[PDB]
Amino acid sequence: SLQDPFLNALRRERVPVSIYLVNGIKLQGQIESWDQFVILLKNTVSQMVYKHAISTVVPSRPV
Amino acid sequence: QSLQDPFLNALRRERVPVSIYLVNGIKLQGQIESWDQFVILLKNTVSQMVYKHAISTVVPSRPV
Amino acid sequence: SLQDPFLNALRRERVPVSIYLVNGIKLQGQIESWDQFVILLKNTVSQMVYKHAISTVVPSRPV
Amino acid sequence: QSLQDPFLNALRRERVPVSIYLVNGIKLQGQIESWDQFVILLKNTVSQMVYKHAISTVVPSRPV
Amino acid sequence: SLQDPFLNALRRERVPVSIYLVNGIKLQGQIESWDQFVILLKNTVSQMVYKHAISTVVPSRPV
Amino acid sequence: QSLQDPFLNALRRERVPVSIYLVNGIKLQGQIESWDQFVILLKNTVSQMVYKHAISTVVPSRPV
Numbered sequence: 001s002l003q004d005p006f007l008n009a010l011r012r013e014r015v016p017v018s019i020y021l022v023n024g025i026k027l028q029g030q031i032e033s034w035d036q037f038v039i040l041l042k043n044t045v046s047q048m049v050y051k052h053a054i055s056t057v058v059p060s061r062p063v
Numbered sequence: 064q065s066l067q068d069p070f071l072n073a074l075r076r077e078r079v080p081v082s083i084y085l086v087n088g089i090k091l092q093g094q095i096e097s098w099d100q101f102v103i104l105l106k107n108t109v110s111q112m113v114y115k116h117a118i119s120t121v122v123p124s125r126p127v
Numbered sequence: 128s129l130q131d132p133f134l135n136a137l138r139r140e141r142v143p144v145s146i147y148l149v150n151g152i153k154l155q156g157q158i159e160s161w162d163q164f165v166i167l168l169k170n171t172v173s174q175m176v177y178k179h180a181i182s183t184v185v186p187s188r189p190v
Numbered sequence: 191q192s193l194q195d196p197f198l199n200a201l202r203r204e205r206v207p208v209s210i211y212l213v214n215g216i217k218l219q220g221q222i223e224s225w226d227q228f229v230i231l232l233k234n235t236v237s238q239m240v241y242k243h244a245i246s247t248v249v250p251s252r253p254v
Numbered sequence: 255s256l257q258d259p260f261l262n263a264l265r266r267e268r269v270p271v272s273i274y275l276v277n278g279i280k281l282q283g284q285i286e287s288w289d290q291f292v293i294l295l296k297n298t299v300s301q302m303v304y305k306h307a308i309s310t311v312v313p314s315r316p317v
Numbered sequence: 318q319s320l321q322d323p324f325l326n327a328l329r330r331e332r333v334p335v336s337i338y339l340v341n342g343i344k345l346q347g348q349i350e351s352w353d354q355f356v357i358l359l360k361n362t363v364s365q366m367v368y369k370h371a372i373s374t375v376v377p378s379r380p381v
Binding site for chain 4: 129130149150151181182185186187189
Binding site: 125 | 148149150152154160161162163164165167172173174175176177179180
């Protein structure tokens with residue numbers, strides 16, 4: 001509900017994000033796509049991140 | 064839900080800053096922007112999207 | 128089902144509790160209120176604790 | 191559910207003490223008081239309410 | 255869906271398994287039984303392992 | 318689901334090896350055998366059953 005427009009705003013302007021995982025690890029890249037359960041984060045290769053493993057998605061700059 | 068919603072709404076309405084402690088121990092701080100069943104948007108320079116499943120406690124900086 | 132009467136017993140007698148989180152952290156206070164997903168723990172300020180982050184709720188004394 | 195319920199019931203019925211290991215590695219020990227879909231009540235001086243989501247394993251001190 | 259036949263294959267041949275938990279801990283034994291939420295792992299005593307706490311179930315040898 | 322399924326299927330179909338990073342930080346590596354709503358079967362000597370709830374990220378060794 002809030003997830004969709006939040007992630008869409010980031011994707012359409014190709015705003016880089018930091019995705020902090022529940023274990024502290026920080027991933028970085030651009031939101032390429034997503035569904036109910038995963039976010040596809042783009043960089044060199046596209047990695048599929050499970051939302052359940054994410055603590056916070058942080059834009060690098062205001063959107 | 065029936066306690067979570069009025070609790071968050073009261074903090075947001077009076078712009079009371081909060082500390083959001085995550086399951087990994089990291090403390091986030093900011094203003095409550097909005098929330099749904101799954102996430103809380105926490106703002107200050109940017110609005111970051113915090114998954115509720117990753118939060119342990121939400122602590123106001125002062126009583127409601 | 129068991130949660131409600133367990134938490135209500137603690138609340139009505141204002142019995143102090145320790146809430147141990149899944150990361151080891153111990154919170155302390157009195158059960159002020161709760162719903163399906165959170166417990167409001169009272170002390171100096173009221174903090175909202177997600178049940179999913181709790182490992183065990185331990186009364187300080189028999190109820 | 192169909193295995194969890196008879197397993198816990200057998201331990202409780204014969205008052206077999208258990209060790210409940212939590213996801214964080216802490217070991218709780220006691221007697222099974224009762225349980226529902228979400229929690230197990232573990233007793234000895236007090237009854238503590240243990241969320242199942244936080245438990246990794248329940249280990250009897252002896253075979254059923 | 256995949257869980258059932260995977261676990262049944264291990265059980266019927268009594269193939270020993272290692273069950274790695276989400277905290278890193280490695281349990282070992284034989285799959286005795288399971289339901290929707292737990293796996294009963296047999297060894298000296300039978301211990302009930304919650305699936306939500308498991309990261310991976312690894313056969314000791316090909317099945 | 319609608320992104321997860323085509324993503325995993327593409328990797329499996331071309332036999333592209335993956336690294337599966339778990340929430341605890343352990344890295345598993347192998348070939349995707351199959352998956353359902355709850356688990357991914359990861360193969361090489363044995364097929365191991367990996368619970369999705371325990372995975373943080375699935376990373377291909379090369380673009381799809």
